[PDB]
Design a protein around this motif. Sequence first.
Motif, PDB file in Angstrom:
ATOM      1  N   UNK A 158      61.884  -5.376  -2.778  1.00 12.89           N
ATOM      2  CA  UNK A 158      60.646  -4.716  -3.182  1.00 12.89           C
ATOM      3  C   UNK A 158      59.933  -5.446  -4.314  1.00 12.89           C
ATOM      4  N   UNK A 159      60.613  -5.642  -5.442  1.00 16.70           N
ATOM      5  CA  UNK A 159      59.947  -6.131  -6.642  1.00 16.70           C
ATOM      6  C   UNK A 159      59.210  -7.441  -6.393  1.00 16.70           C
ATOM      7  N   UNK A 160      59.907  -8.430  -5.834  1.00 15.31           N
ATOM      8  CA  UNK A 160      59.303  -9.750  -5.669  1.00 15.31           C
ATOM      9  C   UNK A 160      58.095  -9.697  -4.741  1.00 15.31           C
ATOM     10  N   UNK A 161      58.313  -9.330  -3.475  1.00 16.39           N
ATOM     11  CA  UNK A 161      57.217  -9.369  -2.512  1.00 16.39           C
ATOM     12  C   UNK A 161      56.061  -8.489  -2.965  1.00 16.39           C
ATOM     13  N   UNK A 162      56.371  -7.294  -3.469  1.00 15.94           N
ATOM     14  CA  UNK A 162      55.329  -6.355  -3.860  1.00 15.94           C
ATOM     15  C   UNK A 162      54.515  -6.875  -5.038  1.00 15.94           C
ATOM     16  N   UNK A 163      55.183  -7.434  -6.046  1.00 17.86           N
ATOM     17  CA  UNK A 163      54.504  -7.735  -7.306  1.00 17.86           C
ATOM     18  C   UNK A 163      53.587  -8.951  -7.186  1.00 17.86           C
ATOM     19  N   UNK A 164      54.157 -10.107  -6.866  1.00 19.82           N
ATOM     20  CA  UNK A 164      53.447 -11.363  -7.025  1.00 19.82           C
ATOM     21  C   UNK A 164      52.471 -11.754  -5.934  1.00 19.82           C
ATOM     22  N   UNK A 165      52.977 -11.954  -4.720  1.00 18.50           N
ATOM     23  CA  UNK A 165      52.202 -12.621  -3.683  1.00 18.50           C
ATOM     24  C   UNK A 165      50.874 -11.913  -3.434  1.00 18.50           C
ATOM     25  N   UNK A 166      49.807 -12.708  -3.369  1.00 19.71           N
ATOM     26  CA  UNK A 166      48.485 -12.218  -2.979  1.00 19.71           C
ATOM     27  C   UNK A 166      48.432 -12.126  -1.451  1.00 19.71           C
ATOM     28  N   UNK A 167      49.167 -11.144  -0.928  1.00 18.44           N
ATOM     29  CA  UNK A 167      49.361 -10.977   0.504  1.00 18.44           C
ATOM     30  C   UNK A 167      48.369 -10.001   1.128  1.00 18.44           C
ATOM     31  N   UNK A 168      47.124  -9.986   0.652  1.00 16.08           N
ATOM     32  CA  UNK A 168      46.110  -9.020   1.063  1.00 16.08           C
ATOM     33  C   UNK A 168      46.074  -8.775   2.568  1.00 16.08           C
ATOM     34  N   UNK A 169      46.513  -9.750   3.359  1.00 18.76           N
ATOM     35  CA  UNK A 169      46.385  -9.675   4.809  1.00 18.76           C
ATOM     36  C   UNK A 169      47.385  -8.668   5.378  1.00 18.76           C
ATOM     37  N   UNK A 170      47.550  -8.688   6.703  1.00 14.75           N
ATOM     38  CA  UNK A 170      48.448  -7.782   7.413  1.00 14.75           C
ATOM     39  C   UNK A 170      49.780  -7.635   6.692  1.00 14.75           C
ATOM     40  N   UNK A 202      59.539  -3.392  -9.364  1.00 12.85           N
ATOM     41  CA  UNK A 202      60.732  -3.612 -10.170  1.00 12.85           C
ATOM     42  C   UNK A 202      61.428  -2.295 -10.484  1.00 12.85           C
ATOM     43  N   UNK A 203      60.686  -1.323 -11.018  1.00  9.98           N
ATOM     44  CA  UNK A 203      61.276  -0.033 -11.349  1.00  9.98           C
ATOM     45  C   UNK A 203      61.693   0.720 -10.097  1.00  9.98           C
ATOM     46  N   UNK A 204      61.091   0.399  -8.954  1.00 18.57           N
ATOM     47  CA  UNK A 204      61.517   1.012  -7.704  1.00 18.57           C
ATOM     48  C   UNK A 204      62.937   0.582  -7.381  1.00 18.57           C
ATOM     49  N   UNK A 205      63.196  -0.721  -7.464  1.00 20.64           N
ATOM     50  CA  UNK A 205      64.569  -1.198  -7.313  1.00 20.64           C
ATOM     51  C   UNK A 205      65.458  -0.634  -8.415  1.00 20.64           C
ATOM     52  N   UNK A 206      64.922  -0.561  -9.634  1.00 15.05           N
ATOM     53  CA  UNK A 206      65.697  -0.073 -10.771  1.00 15.05           C
ATOM     54  C   UNK A 206      66.179   1.344 -10.510  1.00 15.05           C
ATOM     55  N   UNK A 207      65.270   2.216 -10.074  1.00 16.35           N
ATOM     56  CA  UNK A 207      65.640   3.585  -9.738  1.00 16.35           C
ATOM     57  C   UNK A 207      66.572   3.619  -8.539  1.00 16.35           C
ATOM     58  N   UNK A 208      66.281   2.816  -7.511  1.00 14.29           N
ATOM     59  CA  UNK A 208      67.211   2.669  -6.401  1.00 14.29           C
ATOM     60  C   UNK A 208      68.631   2.507  -6.917  1.00 14.29           C
ATOM     61  N   UNK A 209      68.794   1.725  -7.983  1.00  9.61           N
ATOM     62  CA  UNK A 209      70.103   1.607  -8.616  1.00  9.61           C
ATOM     63  C   UNK A 209      70.462   2.875  -9.388  1.00  9.61           C
ATOM     64  N   UNK A 210      69.589   3.300 -10.298  1.00 10.37           N
ATOM     65  CA  UNK A 210      69.806   4.451 -11.167  1.00 10.37           C
ATOM     66  C   UNK A 210      69.625   5.733 -10.368  1.00 10.37           C
ATOM     67  N   UNK A 219      55.615  -0.022   3.563  1.00  9.71           N
ATOM     68  CA  UNK A 219      56.975   0.119   3.056  1.00  9.71           C
ATOM     69  C   UNK A 219      56.979   0.827   1.708  1.00  9.71           C
ATOM     70  N   UNK A 220      56.030   0.475   0.840  1.00  6.74           N
ATOM     71  CA  UNK A 220      55.938   1.099  -0.473  1.00  6.74           C
ATOM     72  C   UNK A 220      55.666   2.591  -0.348  1.00  6.74           C
ATOM     73  N   UNK A 221      54.729   2.954   0.527  1.00  7.33           N
ATOM     74  CA  UNK A 221      54.406   4.360   0.731  1.00  7.33           C
ATOM     75  C   UNK A 221      55.601   5.115   1.295  1.00  7.33           C
ATOM     76  N   UNK A 222      56.310   4.509   2.248  1.00  9.27           N
ATOM     77  CA  UNK A 222      57.480   5.161   2.822  1.00  9.27           C
ATOM     78  C   UNK A 222      58.560   5.370   1.771  1.00  9.27           C
ATOM     79  N   UNK A 223      58.788   4.360   0.930  1.00  2.00           N
ATOM     80  CA  UNK A 223      59.781   4.494  -0.125  1.00  2.00           C
ATOM     81  C   UNK A 223      59.374   5.556  -1.137  1.00  2.00           C
ATOM     82  N   UNK A 224      58.090   5.606  -1.487  1.00  2.00           N
ATOM     83  CA  UNK A 224      57.615   6.631  -2.410  1.00  2.00           C
ATOM     84  C   UNK A 224      57.787   8.009  -1.788  1.00  2.00           C
ATOM     85  N   UNK A 225      57.552   8.110  -0.481  1.00  2.00           N
ATOM     86  CA  UNK A 225      57.769   9.364   0.224  1.00  2.00           C
ATOM     87  C   UNK A 225      59.232   9.767   0.167  1.00  2.00           C
TER      88      UNK A 225
END
Lengths: 135, 88, 186, 190
Positions: C122-134, C104-112, C142-148
Motif C-alpha cells: 500500500x504505502x509505496x504504490x499509493x504514496x509516490x507514483x504519479x499513476x493517474x491512469x487506470x 504508510x499508516x494503513x500498513x502501520x494499522x494493518x500491523x497495529x 484498493x484503497x477504498x476497499x481497505x478503508x471499507x
Amino acid sequence: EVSMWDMETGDRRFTLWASSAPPLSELQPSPHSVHGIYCSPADGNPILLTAGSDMKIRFWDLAYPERSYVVAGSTSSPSVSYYRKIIEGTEVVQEIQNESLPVGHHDIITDVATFQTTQGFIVTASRDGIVKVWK
Amino acid sequence: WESKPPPPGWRPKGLLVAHLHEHKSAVNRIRVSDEHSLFATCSNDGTVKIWNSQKMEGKTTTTRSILTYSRIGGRVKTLTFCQGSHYL
Amino acid sequence: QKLYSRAQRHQEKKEKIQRHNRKLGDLVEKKTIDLRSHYERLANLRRSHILELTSVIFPIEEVKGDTSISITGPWISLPNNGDYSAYYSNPAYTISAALCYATQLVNILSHILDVNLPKKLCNSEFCGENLSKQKFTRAVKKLNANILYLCFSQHVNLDQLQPLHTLRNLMYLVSPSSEHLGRSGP
Amino acid sequence: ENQMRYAQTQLDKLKKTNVFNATFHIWHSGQFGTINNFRLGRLPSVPVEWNEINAAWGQTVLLLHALANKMGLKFQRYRLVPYGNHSYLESLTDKSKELPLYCNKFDHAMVAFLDCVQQFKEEVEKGETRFCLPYRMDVEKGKIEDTGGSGGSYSIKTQFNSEEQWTKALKFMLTNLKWGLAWVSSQFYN
C-alpha cells in the motif's frame, strides 16, 4: 493421523506418520490430527486435501508426499519432508517437519472447499469463525 | 472422490480470494452448492452466513454473507446442500 | 451377556467422555476468555500506538465531505472526502503527502490494528507514483476497499463517517477519539 | 488457544518492532543505507533508484520534522517540508530562498540536513551518558565522520562522493537516525 482402514479387518492400514506417538501408539503421544479430508483419484494414488488441525494446510501425497507441494505454511521448514515406506503388505508414510502478521488461521481449522477449472479457489475456516478463501 | 479425476502432479500454491470473521461463534458446518457457484457458512452462534463466490470474491462494496438467517436459534453446526432438492 | 459386557464398557466410556466434555467445556471457556483478553490488550496497545503516531507524524485535525483535515504540518491538509476525482493528472502537494502518510499508516494499522492489507503493498504504490491512469483507478479501488474493511471492523457508526468521507472517517477511527478504538475480530 | 496465540504474537511483534521501528524500517549496515526498505547510495556495480532517493529524502525531512517538534532539533534550517520527493528544508528564521531536496540547491539541502543532524545530535547527546557519537556529521564543509574510527573518507559533496562516499554517508545518516529514534522509541514506549 491419516490412515486407510480395511473394514473387513476394521482397522486403518495407511499412514503419513507425523506424531510423537509411535505408529498405532497405545498412548498416542501426539494429540494433534488432521481432518476435513477431500478425496479424488489421480497421480497413481488417491489425492487428498484435508484440514490439518495443526493449521497445516494439507495438500497430501502418497507416492512422493515430500516431493509434491501443499498449501500449508511454516516457511521455516526446508523442502517438504514426508516419508514413504512399505510395511507388512502396505506402503507406509511418515510425515516429518523440516515484522509480520500471522496469515494462517489462528483457530482449529476444520472445513475446506475449493472450486477450479485449470485454476480456481479454495475455502478455509477455523474453530471460531475464521474464513480463508484460497485461490 | 471427485468428478473428472484430474491428471497427476497436483500441488498447492500461495493464492487466495477473501477472508471473513462474520460468524460470531465457531463455524463447523458448511455446504457447497452444486448447480451454482455458492457455498454456505454456519456458525455455533446459531446463525448461518450464505456466501456467493461470484459476489463475495470482490469487485463489490462488501463481501458479506448473502443469506444470514438466525431464526433457527441455538448453535447452527449442521448444514448441507440437498442433492438436486432445491432445499438447504 | 457378551453384548451386555460390551455395552457396559461403552457406557463407562460414555461417562468418562462426558466428564471430559465438561472439563473441555470449562477449558474452552477459559481459553476464549484468554483470547478476548489478548484481543483487548491488542486493542489498548493499538490505541496507544495510534495516538502516539497521530500526535507525532500526522496530527490529523479538523478545520476551524468538503471540510478539510490537517496533518503532518501546515504544508499538508486535506478535506474529508478525498480528492480522488482530482488525480487524473499545496492542494496537490498536501493531498499527495497526506496520501503517502495514509498508505504508510494503513500498513502501520494493518500491523497495529491487525487489519492485514488485501493489497499489502500500500504505502509505496499509493504514496509516490504519479499513476493517474487506470493504475490510479485500481489503486484508488484498493484503497477504498481497505478503508471499507477498516470501517467495517470498526463499524461503530457507518452512517456517521458516510461514503466519500475519506479524511472524515480516517480521522474519526484513527484519532484516539474513536468510540471503539482497538477492537478487532468479526 | 490458537486465536489467542495469533493475537498475542501480533502484540509481541508490535512490542518488539516499535511503531517507529516499522515506520522507518531502517538498517544500520548493508550495501546501502536502508530505511523503510530503501537503498541509500549506489556503486559502480550496485543498482539503486534516485527517485527512491527523493522519496527517502522526503522521508528524512518528515522524520526530522517529527523529531524536532518532539524535542528541539529546530534551531536553524528547521523549517522542513515533510512531503517526500522534491522536499524542502529551510530555517524557521530564514525563508527567502527555498532549498529543494531534489533537482547547488540539492547539495545545499544536503548541507542544511547535515546542520539539522548536528543540531539533533546535540539534542540526542544531551543524555547524561553522551549519545549519538559513534560518528559525527559536519554541516557546512560536508563531513560525515564516524567516531568508531573507520578510515573511510565520506563527504557530502555531489562530486567525488556520490557513489561510495554518498552511499556511506546515506547509510551513516540512516544509522544515526536509527540510534536517535531508538532512544526516542525507548522513551515513548515508556
